[PDB]
Amino acid sequence: HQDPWKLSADKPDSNNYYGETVANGMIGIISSPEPLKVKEVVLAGTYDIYKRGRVSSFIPNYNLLNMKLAFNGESVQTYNINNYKQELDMRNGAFTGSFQFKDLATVTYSYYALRHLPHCIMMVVNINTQKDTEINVENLLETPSSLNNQQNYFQNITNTHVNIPLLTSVAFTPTGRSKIAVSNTFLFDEGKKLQPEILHRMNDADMHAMSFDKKIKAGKTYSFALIGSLISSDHINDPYNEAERLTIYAALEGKSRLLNRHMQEWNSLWQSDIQVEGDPQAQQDIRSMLYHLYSFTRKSTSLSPSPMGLSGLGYNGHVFWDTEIWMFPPMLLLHPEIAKSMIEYRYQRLDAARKKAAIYGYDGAMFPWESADSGAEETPVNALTGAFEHHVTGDVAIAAWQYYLVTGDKEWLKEKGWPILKATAEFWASRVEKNDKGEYEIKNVVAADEWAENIDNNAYTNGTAIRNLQYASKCATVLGVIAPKEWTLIADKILISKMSNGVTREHDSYTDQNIKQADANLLAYPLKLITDKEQIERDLKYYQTKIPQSDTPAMTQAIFSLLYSRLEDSDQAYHWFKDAYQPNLNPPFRVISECKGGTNPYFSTGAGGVLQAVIMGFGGLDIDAAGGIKQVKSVLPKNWKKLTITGIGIEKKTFVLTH
Amino acid sequence: HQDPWKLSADKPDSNNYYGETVANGMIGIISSPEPLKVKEVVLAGTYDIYKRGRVSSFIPNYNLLNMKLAFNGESVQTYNINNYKQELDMRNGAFTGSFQFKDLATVTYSYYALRHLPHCIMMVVNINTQKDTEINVENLLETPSSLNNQQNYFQNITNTHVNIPLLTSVAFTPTGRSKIAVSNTFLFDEGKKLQPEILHRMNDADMHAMSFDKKIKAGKTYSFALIGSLISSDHINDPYNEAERLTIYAALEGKSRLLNRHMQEWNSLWQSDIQVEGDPQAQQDIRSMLYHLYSFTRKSTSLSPSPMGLSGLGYNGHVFWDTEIWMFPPMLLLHPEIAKSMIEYRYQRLDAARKKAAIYGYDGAMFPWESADSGAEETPVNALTGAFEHHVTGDVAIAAWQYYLVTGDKEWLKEKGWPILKATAEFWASRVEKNDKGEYEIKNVVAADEWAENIDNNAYTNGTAIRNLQYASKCATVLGVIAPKEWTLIADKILISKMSNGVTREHDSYTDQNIKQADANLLAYPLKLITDKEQIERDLKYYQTKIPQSDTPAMTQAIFSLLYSRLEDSDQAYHWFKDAYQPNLNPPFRVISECKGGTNPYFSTGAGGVLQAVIMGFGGLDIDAAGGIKQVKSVLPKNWKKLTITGIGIEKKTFVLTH
Ligand SMILES: OC[C@H]1O[C@@H](O)[C@H](O)[C@@H](O)[C@@H]1O
Ligand SMILES: OC[C@H]1O[C@@H](O)[C@H](O)[C@@H](O)[C@@H]1O
Ligand SMILES: OC[C@H]1O[C@@H](O)[C@H](O)[C@@H](O)[C@@H]1O
Ligand SMILES: OC[C@H]1O[C@@H](O)[C@H](O)[C@@H](O)[C@@H]1O
Ligand SMILES: OC[C@H]1O[C@@H](O)[C@H](O)[C@@H](O)[C@@H]1O
Ligand SMILES: OC[C@H]1O[C@@H](O)[C@H](O)[C@@H](O)[C@@H]1O
Ligand SMILES: OC[C@H]1O[C@@H](O)[C@H](O)[C@@H](O)[C@@H]1O
Ligand SMILES: OC[C@H]1O[C@@H](O)[C@H](O)[C@@H](O)[C@@H]1O
């Protein structure tokens, strides 16, 4: 089970099973332990009021791949198959099931969220017979309980060459905010005259199906494909016609051309890769982290991932600083065009951030704690983070400036970076309060350590305000503009306080409380406001035992690992690397939960932090304040013989590290 | 586990658990293996388009009793309790859970579908402490995914004596057909000044909750109650205000008065009972059958049970001949007022039956195969039974006439029985076709053996038409009316054919096919068209091996048992009695599934048939063609020392049988 490219499960156990995801940054499909079914389907960019939080959410969507297979009238079930295996191929995001049905046939099915067609899915089914058999195949479109006012359609699209039978459903999200359309077809090798007749049944209010029979002689292979398109009024004004048009398009492109384009795009993503010699488990784990970030993002868009990507409804599909600080940095180094989409998400929502600032009595752009379609605040009102956790504005500024440092794109800086940096600096200049000593305070926030609520001069928050004001001032200089001199005066006098032991104080009421996650240590990395190696170490020593084992998210130990790598402490760096994600794993595919022993995968934020521990920690790679990627001193774990990181920076550099 | 009044489960196993129901004929509550939760709640008389069949259905309703209990901030779960037990007291329909929480407290909770208040539920919680503890109690109103457009309200109803905090939700069934309201309150012993403060939280789109804290010193008992009312626009024009009014009413009646009235009505139901000496398991099983029929019916209404009563959404909550032929006869003998409600259901729907007859080209009243609110046909269109299984009309006629035979109520016969019998006879007179030999045929039906579709002269169907025409003619005579002479001419010449071996032929295309269920044998019982004991036996011999073990419902073996009891064959009668339901049981409460090895309890139809095998078979009790209840020759199982049946007929007679 240490294949560096494949995650395998023998005999999926439904009593202890956490499905894996295939995704193209638009659709995510989460696996079921049941053969030829999927557990959940999530469409990016589609939000409505639904369950948790009384705010906008991702919506469970059509399980559009669900199929029933029968052999001589006998229904295929978990209980009557043997040698049942599931496998995720991380090279091309193919999820494959395979099983034996009694003495009759071997079945393999592979499905894909097509990498080049954001709204298109395909499953390919292969049946290899050991005896004569007749198969009955049904594809079911069940309207999930999350949707309403469904309509169930079926028609034949014909010409002299084809009969494309379309199984289509149209339905609405809970408040009617979004119309969803799904359209499926079967694709056959044998052509119009010989293909099976397709029947349509509408027997339930919430389910219709298309089906066919096929006789297969012993010792033959019969293959067919299911192609589906899934799209909403959030993506296109006429989703009903666009879904049918897409499925017709995909059917006439054909399986080979679809899979070839899919493969080409996945091959391109994997030109940026991390290779570890001497630790097959670490190699597979790091590949899974890269695979999930690649699956949950999309170049050339304005999409940004939630903390759980497209693996489900975690945190309602909202966008948080989880993107800017956790998932963005490793993507910026490996695939700057992915990072570009992530900051494009914020650029597009700058006006909503300006509106939030004005509603809360500030200047400039105040990015929301949680973002969705509009860019307005989406945090549940019972969470004080929505009203008071302000560092997100500085986190957006830091990511914008880092995008420019890595790419050197001055055209992007003028059009997009500077609008963000100027407006977010104006926010901080309005947010600070000057005290009698001429110092600047940021009073009454929720800390990055969210267990500290309505406190003053949070270390991380104050650090992000310093960086936002500094980076905005540097950006103005690149563009030949005079930044307001107040930005530098404020940045230079924002309070960052020490306790009597010389340790960075987390906030003005902090002595020795347990903390939820890294806060003061984030001043060392990522902010690099703390560079003195003795201060870094004093802060690690005091805070590293302040994070409890229970109910603490994977937003701490990866930072500890990276900081110990930078201190050239191999044993401590490796201890914290393992602790960052191995206690958070769920079977059978080693997906990552939010907290130690958690059961809510896949926490893409966690993967992003660990990938920083590997690339910026073990690999020593760093965003140079002057521009570009540089390498600082680092160590490898004892047991790692070689670390190879490919496709780094705009020059696509390979870095090799050894002992 | 052979308590004659109680069904007990130690350590409910959620991997193999079928919940038990408490019901008052209006609300059913199905148990969860989880402490202080319920799995499903069903409201009678509320139908909308939903899931199965694309036709009207019962709707899963508010799980209104769901509570979260925490001890010193620690949440009570399956995993952290011990000595966890559940018990159904069949004497008063109380479902009780009990467990120990660590070293802190023993918890008991009992809930009730109040027998006298159709729309009111109550749960009583008792906490007995072994140490000082603080409890947090939350009652959750989660809008189920079956409902939409919910509103979540909370208010205090106050006067100088009370503060009644009401937690209310209002929502709609899928198409908007029905508005549902639920309103809950906590009832405290200690009075207005000392009762806990109630908080209200609205943190989710589909859930709000009310909660309180309570400090309890070691070695104390703290008790409180949750009262809820659940009602729809199918029951009252203003369900929102009626639900709050009911909960206020129940709160000011108080727990003692509510439970006293509940107990009095259950005591009255159990004045009709079946006592078996020498077989504790049979005694408990037969009590469970009586308990479910009593729970799933209601005197003084026009309610009729579905095949699954209020145990869930089985057969969409529709009414079938399952009432008239299966659940009605044992209720007519034990509690004629229950049977009166069952036939009132049909009387109220006579106009819809007349409309169905006219749409399908017949005269009189054509009762639908499946009935719900209107009395129009509700069968899914893909089931040919809706269009072609016509015997239901004769089944309604037979139950109407039996109601008069048992009660002798000539006023009821004039007002209700005769309208039914006249209209259903007019239907059959229009339904038959006279052939060249002067015989009457009933062509192109689905048989009671539903595996025989679109066949001619079904034995059971033709028998029901004969009885309907005969009973209508007898009814006319009681009322001094001349029935059309054609009814008797047709009844006397409707075809019932024999095969060469002298066995009653199931239909004109029948030779030796497997059959789904009893059909030709129903001519012996219940129709009593076949009285010759050699003919009864010839028919049992030929057909008893024609019902497969798999996918055959519990509508056969109870008839075989009864017929063998009437033939004074104790071994065969007892064989078929056990086979009728023991292979259909689900743990841990021995609920009854539809088919052998099935997993869809509770099949109330099955219980009704078995209760006939016990009362009319072992007890020999019979509806006399001339009026009243008579006793015919019968036998007991070898191992039954005594069978006592109480409350029989309008004279409330006790029958005792021994060897
Ligand atoms: O349908 C898609 C196919 O169309 C043909 O016209 C092209 O020659 C193929 O290269 C292509 O794969
Ligand atoms: O992942 C979403 C959010 O989860 C919370 O547990 C953390 O405290 C936040 O830093 C994070 O943004
Ligand atoms: O979504 C509401 C809140 O959920 C909490 O669990 C997280 O710690 C917050 O970051 C988030 O804002
Ligand atoms: O430790 C986990 C807890 O952290 C808090 O900051 C959040 O507000 C809670 O929603 C969460 O359950
Ligand atoms: O609230 C209900 C109670 O009301 C009192 O007025 C009566 O005396 C009691 O008999 C009754 O149980
Ligand atoms: O219980 C509902 C229906 O179920 C079917 O299995 C039986 O064939 C019918 O006789 C019955 O009315
Ligand atoms: O509800 C549709 C049909 O379901 C079938 O399973 C039953 O055998 C029929 O009696 C019923 O009419
Ligand atoms: O034997 C069970 C089968 O009986 C048939 O009469 C019904 O139409 C089917 O719905 C059912 O599954």
Tab-separated table of C-alpha atoms in Angstrom, chain B residues 271-571:
chain	number	residue	atom	x	y	z
B	271	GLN	CA	-60.198	-4.904	28.049
B	272	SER	CA	-60.115	-6.856	24.699
B	273	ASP	CA	-57.115	-9.206	24.985
B	274	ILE	CA	-55.728	-12.681	24.059
B	275	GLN	CA	-54.125	-14.761	26.891
B	276	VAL	CA	-52.115	-17.950	26.027
B	277	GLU	CA	-50.975	-20.354	28.812
B	278	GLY	CA	-48.008	-22.697	28.057
B	279	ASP	CA	-46.204	-20.553	25.413
B	280	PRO	CA	-44.712	-17.314	26.842
B	281	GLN	CA	-43.166	-16.392	23.439
B	282	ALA	CA	-46.553	-16.757	21.592
B	283	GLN	CA	-48.231	-14.702	24.417
B	284	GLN	CA	-45.713	-11.849	23.928
B	285	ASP	CA	-45.889	-12.086	20.075
B	286	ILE	CA	-49.742	-11.941	20.043
B	287	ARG	CA	-49.682	-8.994	22.537
B	288	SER	CA	-47.279	-7.186	20.145
B	289	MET	CA	-49.732	-7.809	17.249
B	290	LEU	CA	-52.690	-6.413	19.292
B	291	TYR	CA	-50.500	-3.490	20.530
B	292	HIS	CA	-49.600	-2.453	16.941
B	293	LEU	CA	-53.202	-2.661	15.640
B	294	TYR	CA	-54.394	-0.635	18.703
B	295	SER	CA	-51.578	1.937	18.177
B	296	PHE	CA	-52.270	2.244	14.387
B	297	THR	CA	-56.068	2.814	14.654
B	298	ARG	CA	-58.415	5.238	16.444
B	299	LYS	CA	-62.054	4.859	17.472
B	300	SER	CA	-64.507	7.685	16.618
B	301	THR	CA	-62.633	8.811	13.463
B	302	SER	CA	-62.565	8.232	9.695
B	303	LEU	CA	-58.915	7.028	9.878
B	304	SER	CA	-57.777	3.796	8.245
B	305	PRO	CA	-54.297	2.251	8.561
B	306	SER	CA	-51.748	1.730	5.772
B	307	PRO	CA	-50.116	-1.740	5.537
B	308	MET	CA	-47.352	-0.348	7.827
B	309	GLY	CA	-49.646	1.757	10.094
B	310	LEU	CA	-47.673	4.694	11.552
B	311	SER	CA	-44.350	2.737	11.686
B	312	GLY	CA	-42.947	4.644	8.674
B	313	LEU	CA	-43.602	5.389	4.981
B	314	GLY	CA	-44.354	1.765	3.913
B	315	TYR	CA	-46.578	1.774	0.758
B	316	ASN	CA	-46.640	5.625	0.989
B	317	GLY	CA	-49.205	5.451	3.873
B	318	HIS	CA	-51.906	4.427	1.354
B	319	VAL	CA	-54.993	2.426	2.398
B	320	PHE	CA	-55.513	-0.953	0.663
B	321	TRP	CA	-57.745	-4.024	1.083
B	322	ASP	CA	-55.092	-4.710	3.808
B	323	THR	CA	-57.566	-2.853	6.018
B	324	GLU	CA	-60.891	-4.466	4.941
B	325	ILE	CA	-59.717	-8.129	4.767
B	326	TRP	CA	-56.614	-8.232	7.052
B	327	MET	CA	-56.690	-5.629	9.907
B	328	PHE	CA	-60.491	-4.980	10.007
B	329	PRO	CA	-61.833	-8.465	11.026
B	330	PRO	CA	-59.868	-8.911	14.318
B	331	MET	CA	-60.650	-5.261	15.262
B	332	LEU	CA	-64.400	-5.777	14.446
B	333	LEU	CA	-64.523	-8.684	16.934
B	334	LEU	CA	-62.425	-7.018	19.721
B	335	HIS	CA	-63.360	-3.315	19.270
B	336	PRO	CA	-66.217	-2.692	16.831
B	337	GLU	CA	-65.669	1.124	17.233
B	338	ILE	CA	-62.177	0.681	15.622
B	339	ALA	CA	-63.752	-1.240	12.698
B	340	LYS	CA	-66.366	1.583	12.492
B	341	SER	CA	-63.559	4.153	11.881
B	342	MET	CA	-62.033	1.874	9.198
B	343	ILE	CA	-65.307	1.594	7.227
B	344	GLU	CA	-66.060	5.338	7.919
B	345	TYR	CA	-62.850	6.030	5.921
B	346	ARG	CA	-64.491	4.349	2.877
B	347	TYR	CA	-67.986	5.843	3.453
B	348	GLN	CA	-66.416	9.376	3.447
B	349	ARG	CA	-64.684	8.477	0.109
B	350	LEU	CA	-67.749	7.006	-1.654
B	351	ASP	CA	-68.034	10.019	-3.999
B	352	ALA	CA	-64.368	9.584	-5.108
B	353	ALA	CA	-65.141	5.885	-5.799
B	354	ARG	CA	-68.149	6.967	-7.914
B	355	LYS	CA	-65.830	9.348	-9.823
B	356	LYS	CA	-63.286	6.550	-10.431
B	357	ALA	CA	-66.065	4.251	-11.753
B	358	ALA	CA	-67.223	6.918	-14.242
B	359	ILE	CA	-63.621	7.659	-15.450
B	360	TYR	CA	-63.061	3.892	-16.090
B	361	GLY	CA	-66.458	3.385	-17.821
B	362	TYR	CA	-68.422	1.631	-15.014
B	363	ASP	CA	-71.476	2.310	-12.846
B	364	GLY	CA	-71.690	2.790	-9.075
B	365	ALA	CA	-68.610	3.040	-6.825
B	366	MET	CA	-65.230	1.636	-7.874
B	367	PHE	CA	-62.948	1.909	-4.825
B	368	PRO	CA	-59.301	2.547	-5.690
B	369	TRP	CA	-56.563	-0.076	-5.282
B	370	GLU	CA	-54.712	2.539	-3.185
B	371	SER	CA	-56.446	5.357	-1.264
B	372	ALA	CA	-55.139	8.434	0.598
B	373	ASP	CA	-56.726	11.853	1.329
B	374	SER	CA	-59.336	12.258	-1.484
B	375	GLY	CA	-60.328	8.589	-2.034
B	376	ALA	CA	-59.182	8.811	-5.694
B	377	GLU	CA	-56.753	6.228	-7.101
B	378	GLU	CA	-53.227	6.756	-5.687
B	379	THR	CA	-51.424	3.657	-7.051
B	380	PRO	CA	-48.114	4.377	-8.815
B	381	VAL	CA	-48.881	4.233	-12.590
B	382	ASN	CA	-46.107	1.643	-13.237
B	383	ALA	CA	-48.040	-0.817	-10.982
B	384	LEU	CA	-50.840	-2.410	-13.121
B	385	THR	CA	-52.757	-3.087	-9.841
B	386	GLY	CA	-54.008	0.537	-9.865
B	387	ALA	CA	-55.737	0.087	-13.245
B	388	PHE	CA	-56.693	-3.642	-13.047
B	389	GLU	CA	-56.830	-5.077	-9.469
B	390	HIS	CA	-60.578	-4.596	-8.996
B	391	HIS	CA	-61.412	-6.918	-6.064
B	392	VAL	CA	-60.871	-3.972	-3.604
B	393	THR	CA	-64.458	-2.817	-4.409
B	394	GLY	CA	-65.878	-6.160	-3.230
B	395	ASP	CA	-63.505	-6.141	-0.200
B	396	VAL	CA	-65.018	-2.790	0.942
B	397	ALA	CA	-68.571	-4.226	0.479
B	398	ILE	CA	-67.698	-7.369	2.521
B	399	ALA	CA	-66.301	-5.273	5.429
B	400	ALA	CA	-69.426	-2.982	5.338
B	401	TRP	CA	-71.794	-5.983	5.559
B	402	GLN	CA	-69.658	-7.659	8.286
B	403	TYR	CA	-69.839	-4.408	10.351
B	404	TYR	CA	-73.673	-4.709	10.267
B	405	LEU	CA	-73.620	-8.498	10.973
B	406	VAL	CA	-71.497	-7.980	14.163
B	407	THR	CA	-73.152	-4.762	15.519
B	408	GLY	CA	-76.766	-5.194	14.233
B	409	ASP	CA	-76.786	-1.351	13.815
B	410	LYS	CA	-79.686	-0.873	11.337
B	411	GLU	CA	-79.378	2.968	11.589
B	412	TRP	CA	-75.727	2.657	10.423
B	413	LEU	CA	-76.844	0.208	7.703
B	414	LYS	CA	-79.411	2.724	6.354
B	415	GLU	CA	-77.101	5.806	6.516
B	416	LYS	CA	-73.689	4.279	5.526
B	417	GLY	CA	-73.708	0.508	4.864
B	418	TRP	CA	-76.405	0.551	2.184
B	419	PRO	CA	-74.889	3.553	0.277
B	420	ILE	CA	-71.649	1.483	0.055
B	421	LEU	CA	-73.333	-1.870	-0.712
B	422	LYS	CA	-75.740	-0.426	-3.343
B	423	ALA	CA	-73.009	1.550	-5.192
B	424	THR	CA	-70.451	-1.320	-5.124
B	425	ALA	CA	-73.114	-3.800	-6.354
B	426	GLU	CA	-73.967	-1.386	-9.225
B	427	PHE	CA	-70.232	-1.410	-10.081
B	428	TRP	CA	-70.088	-5.235	-10.277
B	429	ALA	CA	-73.358	-5.425	-12.272
B	430	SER	CA	-71.650	-3.077	-14.849
B	431	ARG	CA	-68.267	-4.914	-14.603
B	432	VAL	CA	-69.390	-8.476	-15.501
B	433	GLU	CA	-69.848	-9.702	-19.118
B	434	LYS	CA	-72.492	-12.389	-19.902
B	435	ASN	CA	-71.151	-15.110	-22.269
B	436	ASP	CA	-73.079	-17.345	-24.786
B	437	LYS	CA	-73.653	-20.021	-22.052
B	438	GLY	CA	-75.409	-17.362	-19.849
B	439	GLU	CA	-72.457	-17.333	-17.381
B	440	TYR	CA	-70.995	-14.045	-16.044
B	441	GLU	CA	-67.272	-13.364	-16.510
B	442	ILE	CA	-64.952	-10.727	-15.004
B	443	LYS	CA	-62.288	-10.337	-17.701
B	444	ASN	CA	-58.826	-8.691	-17.691
B	445	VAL	CA	-57.902	-8.163	-13.995
B	446	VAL	CA	-54.835	-8.459	-11.807
B	447	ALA	CA	-55.499	-11.365	-9.393
B	448	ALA	CA	-55.191	-11.259	-5.576
B	449	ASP	CA	-52.214	-13.410	-6.622
B	450	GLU	CA	-50.712	-10.247	-8.146
B	451	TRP	CA	-48.170	-12.280	-10.199
B	452	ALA	CA	-51.136	-13.140	-12.468
B	453	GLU	CA	-51.696	-9.924	-14.477
B	454	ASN	CA	-54.349	-9.184	-17.163
B	455	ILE	CA	-56.043	-12.610	-16.787
B	456	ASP	CA	-59.739	-13.624	-16.667
B	457	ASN	CA	-62.104	-14.931	-13.941
B	458	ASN	CA	-59.705	-14.706	-10.973
B	459	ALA	CA	-61.169	-16.949	-8.205
B	460	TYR	CA	-60.812	-14.352	-5.406
B	461	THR	CA	-62.020	-11.391	-7.551
B	462	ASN	CA	-65.054	-13.344	-8.832
B	463	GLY	CA	-65.794	-14.506	-5.250
B	464	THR	CA	-65.736	-10.893	-3.931
B	465	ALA	CA	-68.166	-9.842	-6.719
B	466	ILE	CA	-70.515	-12.759	-5.753
B	467	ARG	CA	-70.393	-11.730	-2.049
B	468	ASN	CA	-70.802	-8.011	-2.860
B	469	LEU	CA	-73.946	-8.702	-4.946
B	470	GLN	CA	-75.374	-11.174	-2.356
B	471	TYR	CA	-74.702	-8.897	0.663
B	472	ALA	CA	-76.143	-5.807	-1.161
B	473	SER	CA	-79.319	-7.867	-1.894
B	474	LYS	CA	-79.543	-8.979	1.802
B	475	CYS	CA	-78.977	-5.354	2.950
B	476	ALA	CA	-81.881	-4.109	0.741
B	477	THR	CA	-84.151	-6.724	2.423
B	478	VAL	CA	-83.170	-5.533	5.960
B	479	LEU	CA	-84.202	-1.973	4.882
B	480	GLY	CA	-87.460	-3.121	3.151
B	481	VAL	CA	-86.107	-2.298	-0.362
B	482	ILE	CA	-86.392	-4.556	-3.496
B	483	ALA	CA	-82.785	-5.034	-4.756
B	484	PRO	CA	-82.465	-5.222	-8.585
B	485	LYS	CA	-83.202	-8.922	-9.357
B	486	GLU	CA	-80.161	-8.801	-11.755
B	487	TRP	CA	-77.793	-8.723	-8.711
B	488	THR	CA	-78.865	-12.250	-7.615
B	489	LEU	CA	-79.025	-13.548	-11.261
B	490	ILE	CA	-75.426	-12.331	-11.790
B	491	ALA	CA	-74.160	-13.554	-8.347
B	492	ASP	CA	-75.564	-17.067	-9.024
B	493	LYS	CA	-73.803	-17.378	-12.455
B	494	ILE	CA	-70.362	-15.680	-11.919
B	495	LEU	CA	-67.757	-18.268	-13.003
B	496	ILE	CA	-65.726	-20.173	-10.379
B	497	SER	CA	-64.005	-23.030	-12.277
B	498	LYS	CA	-62.239	-26.258	-11.180
B	499	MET	CA	-59.242	-27.995	-12.828
B	500	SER	CA	-59.407	-31.717	-13.766
B	501	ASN	CA	-58.150	-32.713	-10.225
B	502	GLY	CA	-61.224	-30.911	-8.709
B	503	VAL	CA	-59.056	-27.999	-7.386
B	504	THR	CA	-60.434	-24.418	-7.605
B	505	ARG	CA	-58.668	-22.821	-10.633
B	506	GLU	CA	-57.015	-19.482	-9.678
B	507	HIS	CA	-57.801	-17.899	-13.138
B	508	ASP	CA	-58.548	-19.016	-16.759
B	509	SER	CA	-54.782	-19.191	-17.688
B	510	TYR	CA	-53.775	-21.009	-14.432
B	511	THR	CA	-52.247	-24.550	-14.453
B	512	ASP	CA	-49.405	-24.821	-11.892
B	513	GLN	CA	-47.694	-21.402	-11.694
B	514	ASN	CA	-46.126	-20.252	-8.408
B	515	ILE	CA	-48.423	-17.664	-6.752
B	516	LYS	CA	-47.529	-14.591	-4.701
B	517	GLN	CA	-50.099	-15.165	-1.950
B	518	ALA	CA	-53.443	-16.779	-1.016
B	519	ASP	CA	-56.136	-16.366	-3.719
B	520	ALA	CA	-58.258	-19.498	-4.383
B	521	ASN	CA	-57.860	-20.475	-0.658
B	522	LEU	CA	-59.522	-17.105	0.298
B	523	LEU	CA	-62.819	-18.591	-1.135
B	524	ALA	CA	-62.758	-20.903	1.943
B	525	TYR	CA	-61.778	-18.098	4.402
B	526	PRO	CA	-62.731	-15.276	4.561
B	527	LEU	CA	-65.422	-15.517	1.825
B	528	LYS	CA	-66.825	-18.936	2.995
B	529	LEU	CA	-68.050	-19.591	-0.618
B	530	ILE	CA	-66.245	-22.967	-0.194
B	531	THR	CA	-67.592	-24.820	2.915
B	532	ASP	CA	-67.144	-28.494	1.776
B	533	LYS	CA	-64.221	-29.702	4.008
B	534	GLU	CA	-62.872	-32.054	1.234
B	535	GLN	CA	-62.831	-29.118	-1.282
B	536	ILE	CA	-61.103	-26.859	1.322
B	537	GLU	CA	-58.431	-29.577	1.848
B	538	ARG	CA	-57.952	-30.305	-1.950
B	539	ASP	CA	-57.371	-26.561	-2.467
B	540	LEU	CA	-54.892	-26.323	0.498
B	541	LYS	CA	-53.020	-29.426	-0.777
B	542	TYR	CA	-52.578	-27.986	-4.340
B	543	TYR	CA	-51.778	-24.335	-3.488
B	544	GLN	CA	-49.864	-24.500	-0.114
B	545	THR	CA	-46.520	-25.280	-1.915
B	546	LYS	CA	-47.172	-22.675	-4.705
B	547	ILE	CA	-46.019	-19.660	-2.522
B	548	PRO	CA	-42.213	-19.287	-2.778
B	549	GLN	CA	-40.056	-18.596	0.346
B	550	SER	CA	-38.668	-15.276	-1.097
B	551	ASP	CA	-40.456	-11.979	-1.896
B	552	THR	CA	-43.923	-13.229	-0.812
B	553	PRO	CA	-45.855	-11.073	1.670
B	554	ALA	CA	-47.426	-12.143	5.020
B	555	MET	CA	-50.928	-12.584	3.454
B	556	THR	CA	-51.054	-16.408	3.066
B	557	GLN	CA	-49.861	-18.642	5.916
B	558	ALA	CA	-52.258	-17.152	8.548
B	559	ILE	CA	-55.157	-18.219	6.225
B	560	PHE	CA	-53.619	-21.724	5.878
B	561	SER	CA	-53.352	-21.848	9.750
B	562	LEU	CA	-56.998	-20.774	10.249
B	563	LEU	CA	-58.277	-23.278	7.601
B	564	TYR	CA	-56.286	-26.161	9.193
B	565	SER	CA	-57.656	-25.141	12.688
B	566	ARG	CA	-61.201	-25.315	11.157
B	567	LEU	CA	-60.274	-28.813	9.755
B	568	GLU	CA	-59.186	-29.694	13.380
B	569	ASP	CA	-55.554	-30.385	12.225
B	570	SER	CA	-53.519	-28.994	15.201
B	571	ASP	CA	-50.012	-29.832	13.780
